[PDB]
Amino acid sequence: NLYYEPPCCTGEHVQDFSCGPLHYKTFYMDERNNALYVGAMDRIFRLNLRNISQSICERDVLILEPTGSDILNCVSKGKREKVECRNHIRVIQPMNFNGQKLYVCGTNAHNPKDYVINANLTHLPRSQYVPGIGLGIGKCPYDPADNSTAVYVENGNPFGLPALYAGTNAEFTKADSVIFRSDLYNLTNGRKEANFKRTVKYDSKLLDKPNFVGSFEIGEFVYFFFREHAVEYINCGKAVYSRVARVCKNDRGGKYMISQNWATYLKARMNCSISSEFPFYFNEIQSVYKMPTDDTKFYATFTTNTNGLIGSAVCSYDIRDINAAFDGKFKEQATSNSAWLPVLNSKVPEPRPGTCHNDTATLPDSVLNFIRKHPLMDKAVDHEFGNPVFFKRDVILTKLVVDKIRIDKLNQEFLVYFVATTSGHIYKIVQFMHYGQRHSNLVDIFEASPHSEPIREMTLSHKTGSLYVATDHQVKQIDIAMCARRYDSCFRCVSDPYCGWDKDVNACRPYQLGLLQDVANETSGICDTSVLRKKVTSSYGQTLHLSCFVKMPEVLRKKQTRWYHHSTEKGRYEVRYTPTKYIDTNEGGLVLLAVNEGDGGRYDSYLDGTLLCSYGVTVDAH
Amino acid sequence: NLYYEPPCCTGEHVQDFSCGPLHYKTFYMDERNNALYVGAMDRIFRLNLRNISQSICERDVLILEPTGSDILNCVSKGKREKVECRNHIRVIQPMNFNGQKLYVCGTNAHNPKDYVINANLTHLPRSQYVPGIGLGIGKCPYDPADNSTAVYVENGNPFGLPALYAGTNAEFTKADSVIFRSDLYNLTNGRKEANFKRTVKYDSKLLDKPNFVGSFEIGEFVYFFFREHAVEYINCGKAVYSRVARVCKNDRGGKYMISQNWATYLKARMNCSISSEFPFYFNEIQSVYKMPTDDTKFYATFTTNTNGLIGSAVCSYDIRDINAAFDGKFKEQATSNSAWLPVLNSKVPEPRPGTCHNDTATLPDSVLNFIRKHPLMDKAVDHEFGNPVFFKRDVILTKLVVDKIRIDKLNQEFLVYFVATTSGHIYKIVQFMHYGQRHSNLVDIFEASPHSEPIREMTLSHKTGSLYVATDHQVKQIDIAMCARRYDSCFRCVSDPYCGWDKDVNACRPYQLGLLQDVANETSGICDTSVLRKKVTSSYGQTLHLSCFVKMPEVLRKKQTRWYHHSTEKGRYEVRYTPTKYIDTNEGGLVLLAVNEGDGGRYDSYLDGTLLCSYGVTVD
Ligand SMILES: *[C@@H]1O[C@H](CO)[C@@H](O[C@@H]2O[C@H](CO)[C@@H](O[C@@H]3O[C@H](CO[C@H]4O[C@H](CO[C@H]5O[C@H](CO)[C@@H](O)[C@H](O)[C@@H]5O[C@H]5O[C@H](CO)[C@@H](O)[C@H](O)[C@@H]5O)[C@@H](O)[C@H](O[C@H]5O[C@H](CO)[C@@H](O)[C@H](O)[C@@H]5O)[C@@H]4O)[C@@H](O)[C@H](O[C@H]4O[C@H](CO)[C@@H](O)[C@H](O)[C@@H]4O[C@H]4O[C@H](CO)[C@@H](O)[C@H](O)[C@@H]4O)[C@@H]3O)[C@H](O)[C@H]2NC(C)=O)[C@H](O)[C@H]1NC(C)=O
Ligand SMILES: *[C@@H]1O[C@H](CO)[C@@H](O[C@@H]2O[C@H](CO)[C@@H](O[C@H]3O[C@H](CO[C@H]4O[C@H](CO[C@H]5O[C@H](CO)[C@@H](O)[C@H](O)[C@@H]5O[C@H]5O[C@H](CO)[C@@H](O)[C@H](O)[C@@H]5O)[C@@H](O)[C@H](O[C@H]5O[C@H](CO)[C@@H](O)[C@H](O)[C@@H]5O)[C@@H]4O)[C@@H](O)[C@H](O[C@H]4O[C@H](CO)[C@@H](O)[C@H](O)[C@@H]4O)[C@@H]3O)[C@H](O)[C@H]2NC(C)=O)[C@H](O)[C@H]1NC(C)=O
Ligand SMILES: *[C@@H]1O[C@H](CO)[C@@H](O[C@@H]2O[C@H](CO)[C@@H](O[C@@H]3O[C@H](CO[C@H]4O[C@H](CO)[C@@H](O)[C@H](O)[C@@H]4O)[C@@H](O)[C@H](O[C@H]4O[C@H](CO)[C@@H](O)[C@H](O)[C@@H]4O[C@H]4O[C@H](CO)[C@@H](O)[C@H](O)[C@@H]4O)[C@@H]3O)[C@H](O)[C@H]2NC(C)=O)[C@H](O)[C@H]1NC(C)=O
Ligand SMILES: *[C@@H]1O[C@H](CO)[C@@H](O[C@@H]2O[C@H](CO)[C@@H](O[C@@H]3O[C@H](CO[C@H]4O[C@H](CO)[C@@H](O)[C@H](O[C@H]5O[C@H](CO)[C@@H](O)[C@H](O)[C@@H]5O)[C@@H]4O)[C@@H](O)[C@H](O)[C@@H]3O)[C@H](O)[C@H]2NC(C)=O)[C@H](O)[C@H]1NC(C)=O
Ligand SMILES: *[C@@H]1O[C@H](CO)[C@@H](O[C@@H]2O[C@H](CO)[C@@H](O[C@@H]3O[C@H](CO[C@H]4O[C@H](CO)[C@@H](O)[C@H](O)[C@@H]4O)[C@@H](O)[C@H](O)[C@@H]3O)[C@H](O)[C@H]2NC(C)=O)[C@H](O)[C@H]1NC(C)=O
Ligand SMILES: *[C@@H]1O[C@H](CO)[C@@H](O[C@@H]2O[C@H](CO)[C@@H](O[C@@H]3O[C@H](CO[C@H]4O[C@H](CO)[C@@H](O)[C@H](O)[C@@H]4O)[C@@H](O)[C@H](O)[C@@H]3O)[C@H](O)[C@H]2NC(C)=O)[C@H](O)[C@H]1NC(C)=O
Ligand SMILES: *[C@@H]1O[C@H](CO)[C@@H](O[C@@H]2O[C@H](CO)[C@@H](O[C@H]3O[C@H](CO[C@H]4O[C@H](CO)[C@@H](O)[C@H](O)[C@@H]4O)[C@@H](O)[C@H](O)[C@@H]3O)[C@H](O)[C@H]2NC(C)=O)[C@H](O)[C@H]1NC(C)=O
Ligand SMILES: *[C@@H]1O[C@H](CO)[C@@H](O[C@@H]2O[C@H](CO)[C@@H](O[C@@H]3O[C@H](CO)[C@@H](O)[C@H](O)[C@@H]3O)[C@H](O)[C@H]2NC(C)=O)[C@H](O)[C@H]1NC(C)=O
Ligand SMILES: *[C@@H]1O[C@H](CO)[C@@H](O[C@@H]2O[C@H](CO)[C@@H](O)[C@H](O)[C@H]2NC(C)=O)[C@H](O)[C@H]1NC(C)=O
Ligand SMILES: *[C@@H]1O[C@H](CO)[C@@H](O[C@@H]2O[C@H](CO)[C@@H](O)[C@H](O)[C@H]2NC(C)=O)[C@H](O)[C@H]1NC(C)=O
Ligand SMILES: *[C@@H]1O[C@H](CO)[C@@H](O[C@@H]2O[C@H](CO)[C@@H](O)[C@H](O)[C@H]2NC(C)=O)[C@H](O)[C@H]1NC(C)=O
Ligand SMILES: *[C@@H]1O[C@H](CO)[C@@H](O)[C@H](O)[C@H]1NC(C)=O
Ligand SMILES: *[C@@H]1O[C@H](CO)[C@@H](O)[C@H](O)[C@H]1NC(C)=O
């Protein structure tokens, strides 16, 4: 009766875009030009970032479908031509080539093909040839189901030349998982200046059935995030571990026989666990996110193995801890029958393997010999505070974006995580500090996609204050703050860091100084004077139904509702549920069966000890 | 008016015995003599097995408290005098010595002491001395919080002599975990005939912080069940594994320098996992149970590590799978920096290590050298069907007992597991077979102890049809079949293997041929003619509350309540839950607000697609 929250967000603060079941995947956001590029099957879209509903299917698209030759070879004798032999876009990157243009790569019917196109989704002139395009190693997956990553890097490579860094698995029939860098071309004079870079082929010490979840350029390096079969666990069982790997941007490879291989490739296990004498590990990373303005923090989701009892967690990682693992001890298995042990630093050659050098071919061979035999660091990368930001049983958390909020006049700084689930929901998790410790609270759960439709991509725009979600059927823009629309109660309003309750107008608003807010729940009872007792009348003998929410908000549905009654000649007491007098509803409601005289009076409803709503009941003689 | 199940069982089918916070622990059940012996702090009781409330505190007890010097020395070491420095009974075993006597061992103020007493809880005459009795060191723990085990064996030991086998800690401050056999005495002539047997002292390959949960004499062996730090896991992290260890009762030890050590000690990991490409392990065994008349099956509880996300499982084991591990390949860590690998059979000496022999000192030294370096088998003992009988998230399962109901027709059988939790509850799980596949069903949950009072011991008397639970505050006898008391509905009655529904009396009775029963849920409409049916009226469109149970039984809250509405103008349709019209009640009810003309009709309540109760709604 009192509180009603409109469902969200699959019913304005929500904008949809769809041209059919085109398997939308791969985001590239250009805030300065109000553009959200979205890849799809045989297509790339340029959506209006401010309001993706204002984009038109026929206008804001560029068709990139395979040739009849590539479709023929892909079908062969037997293969699905319906989606598997289409051109699934997997890479969309900003690329400098006589101005700001887009580098695009697609699966192209199991024949990865890359392109360079204008920002307005037009081809370059037919006479315009871009050096390196269509040549070399496949730059994106052969398979639409492959989990790959890529990042186009303008600065820091050998000779100041641009290059694409990428991790991919190519065909699943063959076993060629690789982290590679494209050939270094001078795009002006067309000369190939340096050969490509790649992990040693078929070396399971470098990659063992990886699934890539992200890649970033930071400082003088490029970092890759993936999960893989844990080689160092084989003597104890089968496990999938999470990895961050690192290469120097200026890596040129070693001497003649190994010049095509990385000379600086290292990787480390990522630690996401609940701390104790027996740490509980979430071993399988699902996605990683970096704030565009912060190159020092990485936020990632991890799950247990999805067989058996399931749990998910969110952990955060500081670049100094990542690099600490790469500056620390190496791991080593001396023989195939040996334990995995740390290497004495006195055994490490000089210069230290993994450090950057302008001329890696000049490094002593002992350095290259060592790094090719010790790609794995001994240290597992420390997660901040040694515990998950957030963890949850029986949920698979996948994509995530992270926002930042500062209230400098009250000295409160919050992170807000938006984390997708395999069921199509978004978790709204706020992080805050209290007495030197980090805490989190699940602020909200809303629906972004039906259960049968997985969330394939998620990104975030600080400029538009919107979250973008891609599924197989549409793209969905969701405002990260819906204070006025979503929260009609002080109770819900003050828990959201974007919001604040205005007791004057009795409504939830975007936060500003002077509004009620308690993200950390450190002033419980702040909403007491904002609970407006609703007076109601009822005749003698008829059934009355008291309820705060029409439907209890999802994040609150598993908390305790306790009702109290205060009438004349009766002290205030808790309402015990009897079969034919007091009934509870799964929404925290109170039903009065056979109302008599003494049933009238004050009724208070508390949720985990905090006052939720109040009623004034009057009963006549009928 | 509604189905009502009264609470159970903390309040004629439940009997209590208590003489104070005496820390009741250690059961020994003598069904032939209607006795349940219970150890306690400084006390041992003999309870009437048929009805433990008949027992009298002052009459059915023998005080066994430490000497004043024992208590003095116990607090000299820095222990707490109130509880730690008392004599906690930890072993009660039947023992032949001029008749049927009892072997008793207690912690005795961190100075383990053992005794031999009569079955009626009286001391033997002081003139009568029992050879070997006196010091309990190696026989029961120093610490009341220790998890130890022991079994007294009359037959199969060297020279036909009796012996106590035990796993415990041999030192109160220093760590000396040991699996141990007492000195072989001839109790008639009083001579010490053979020395004790023990695992090599301080050898982490044999025991590494073990917590023992049971021990049994089976065939020519004694088996020990325990969990311990997983030594073969150290290169990958920290873990606790579950083990079964085995010694030959034959065992006399090797030659002169190692004569005191087992020559036949082997152990193997125990596998309790959900089967898949990535098995999910429950690694920490909590208790093990064997049926008195069956030496081929063992039933155990396993938990994940209690830090982090928690689950518990019940797995069963066949003796042949246990011995298959001991007959299989050995595990080996060649050097301290080596992987753990299986040993080529051609490298194993003869006679095969771990096999029994009348004269183990005669075994070639190479056999003894091998078995002392390779105590751990490569194979992990297969659990039956490769999956838990039953597993549950968010609960810690501890003690368990298992009953067998024999069906005459077609040689079938039900197993009923009674499994305690740390919260004081007993899970009642029936296991049944169908097309050669194993199934289980959680039939009931009831309360045997308050949450803050953990369950310390649990046993089962098939003769009396009762289980017995020991807590710090009391002993509780609970009938395993409470058909008439617990179930007042056909729905609940037919699912319990002990019970059957009688339509003539409209009640639940102990099962006999003719009553309705559907443990396997193969005739879902069996209770349709016996469901709760009633008619209700709603005036002026007031809010109406339909319901079947007073309180939904705990095991039924997991299923989905669905209401169907039959009208002459709307047909039979499932009532869609809409916030402005239809609300759910935590006890399976249906709340119709703003009743109208079209709301009238028949309302059937189904629990997971089985009819629970039906309504006839008319509106005026
Ligand atoms: C992710 O982040 C988590 C949170 O930050 C982090 O949690 C911390 O986890 C640990 C568990 O990993 C918690 O517990 C501690 O565990 C320590 C390690 O103990 C075990 O490991 C020993 C070493 O074995 C490795 O190293 C050998 C030599 O290289 C190899 O031969 C082995 O094969 C093994 O190698 C593996 O691990 C190496 C290091 O990771 C790695 O290089 C290698 O490649 C391979 O992967 C074992 O010797 C030890 O076994 C001994 O002890 C057990 C009893 O537990 C016996 O059963 C065994 O038979 C054996 O004798 C373990 O298997 C412990 O040392 C540590 O103990 C100290 O602290 C506790 C209190 O915290 C004291 O009670 C205890 O007495 C110890 O105190 C003393 O010593 C230490 C140093 O020795 C000293 O600092 C201290 O002041 C005191 O003097 C403790 O139990 C820990 O609590 C967690 N922290 C928090 C804050 O929660 C997690 O590890 C991270 N994960 C990863 C992967 O990094
Ligand atoms: C409890 O009961 C459960 C239910 O009954 C059991 O479940 C079964 O679990 C297994 C997994 O454990 C599932 O199988 C899939 O795994 C197996 C095993 O493969 C892994 O192990 C291989 C061998 O590693 C070990 O032996 C080496 C040789 O001795 C050692 O050098 C090494 O250090 C390992 O040692 C440990 O294990 C052994 C044996 O247990 C032990 O003696 C040691 O002391 C030590 O503890 C590895 O080679 C594999 O690695 C592979 O993957 C790497 C990438 O990560 C590659 O780099 C590498 O080259 C290799 O490819 C794995 O780590 C597979 O054999 C099995 O194969 C499928 O496919 C083959 C194809 O031919 C087929 O023949 C198989 O039948 C199977 O279909 C699977 O991949 C089972 O599915 C599962 N069973 C059921 C019914 O669900 C559980 O095992 C049991 N637990 C215990 C502890 O007993
Ligand atoms: C990818 O590949 C492209 C294409 O090759 C490359 O771009 C080229 O870089 C070179 C090197 O910087 C450029 O060459 C220089 O260009 C400047 C500017 O020239 C134009 O503008 C002037 C007006 O100021 C006109 O007069 C001229 O005709 C051009 O239109 C010149 O000033 C440079 O001249 C010096 O060096 C020449 C030899 O290299 C001499 O012949 C000449 O006399 C000049 O010498 C004087 O200056 C030197 C220092 O600059 C000094 O060392 C001498 O002693 C002497 O004092 C030179 O021609 C070229 O224009 C670029 N081309 C394009 C299309 O941009 C990219 O650099 C490459 N990418 C990467 C990452 O390497
Ligand atoms: C790239 O990375 C992604 C993400 O990490 C990988 O995606 C996993 O991919 C596999 C294979 O495609 C998926 O597994 C499938 O899931 C299907 C949907 O199953 C759910 O829904 C069913 C109802 O329709 C339900 O029955 C099913 O239950 C089963 O799984 C439960 C645990 O997941 C288990 O408890 C149940 O008992 C039961 O076994 C699921 O709830 C299913 O129909 C398929 O048979 C198959 O299982 C995973 O869902 C993907 N995971 C995620 C997080 O998206 C992808 O494989 C990677 N690519 C490569 C090449 O490796
Ligand atoms: C802000 O913080 C306040 C505390 O700092 C919150 O108030 C408290 O909230 C808790 C619940 O989180 C209430 O909890 C109690 O829980 C115990 C134990 O609970 C368990 O056992 C029962 C019985 O089996 C089981 O049913 C439950 O599910 C639990 O597993 C109960 O015994 C108590 O009766 C009570 O329910 C506190 O009562 C409550 N008040 C105080 C003063 O602690 C407050 O809700 C927070 N506000 C927010 C988050 O908006
Ligand atoms: C022998 O085996 C036993 C069973 O496996 C082992 O038992 C474990 O013993 C430890 C320590 O004695 C217990 O840990 C403690 O739990 C208590 C009480 O916990 C409960 O109450 C608190 C509130 O007071 C609540 O927060 C918890 O959630 C519990 O509800 C704590 O107060 C202690 O600080 C400590 O954490 C284990 O709980 C217990 N586990 C089980 C399954 O019984 C025993 O340790 C073994 N003996 C030896 C010598 O190792
Ligand atoms: C623990 O110690 C107990 C006390 O000694 C053992 O019990 C004793 O067992 C012996 C059996 O050897 C038993 O003796 C029997 O034989 C005696 C002599 O008999 C022989 O002599 C006749 C004629 O002299 C000859 O023809 C036969 O071939 C044979 O060689 C008899 O005098 C005696 O009455 C009896 O028949 C002892 O009586 C018995 N002692 C007691 C107190 O029971 C016990 O065996 C041992 N436990 C184990 C497991 O070894
Ligand atoms: C005895 O066995 C029958 C046959 O399985 C049980 O009926 C079935 O119960 C399951 C749930 O255990 C029902 O499944 C569910 O369907 C809903 C709606 O589609 C879905 O949301 C759930 O995820 C689940 O899949 C199933 O519909 C139902 N079958 C029929 C015909 O009603 C019955 O509950 C068992 N009875 C007892 C007392 O165990
Ligand atoms: C985002 O764009 C869509 C489409 O242009 C807007 O939807 C329209 O809303 C106006 C006024 O509310 C109507 O007159 C149109 O008929 C709507 N068009 C469609 C296709 O529904 C939407 O309002 C825009 N949202 C924002 C926040 O500007
Ligand atoms: C088990 O023994 C208890 C204790 O003797 C019985 O409880 C008593 O029942 C008798 C009647 O048989 C009453 O006279 C006593 O007042 C009861 N005492 C208590 C403390 O309850 C109990 O009835 C016996 N149960 C069975 C099944 O024999
Ligand atoms: C407890 O049991 C012992 C052992 O049977 C009893 O002691 C016997 O008492 C009878 C007399 O009734 C004597 O003839 C035996 O010689 C005794 N045997 C021993 C080994 O002492 C004792 O009387 C019993 N006590 C009670 C109270 O029943
Ligand atoms: C390495 O290259 C950078 C950039 O070209 C340059 O500034 C630096 O001086 C070089 N250092 C050496 C030692 O060659
Ligand atoms: C071992 O002793 C038992 C009984 O003591 C006997 O039956 C068996 O034959 C003996 N075996 C050998 C090899 O002496």
Numbering used by the authors:
A (entry chain A): 40 to 50, 62 to 672
B (entry chain B): 40 to 50, 62 to 670
Manuscript excerpt for this entry:
The secreted semaphorins Sema2a and Sema2b also contain an Ig-like domain positioned C-terminally to their PSI domains. Sema2a and Sema2b are very similar and share over 67% sequence identity. A superposition of Sema2a1–3 and Sema2b1–3 crystal structures unveiled that Sema2a and Sema2b are also highly similar in structure with an rmsd of 1.1 Å over 608 Cα atoms (for Sema2a chain A and Sema2b chain A). Most notable variations are observed in the distribution of charged patches located on their surfaces. On the other hand, when we mutated the equivalent cysteine residue to serine in Sema2afull and Sema2bfull, both proteins partially maintained the homodimeric architecture and a mixture of a monomer and a non-covalent dimer was observed. However, this distinctive glycan is also well-ordered in the Sema1b and Sema2b structures. Within classes, Sema2b binds PlexB ~8 times more strongly than Sema2a. Given the essentially identical architecture of Sema2a and Sema2b, we conclude that their different binding properties either in strength or lifetime of binding to PlexB or interaction with additional co-receptor, determine their distinct functions.
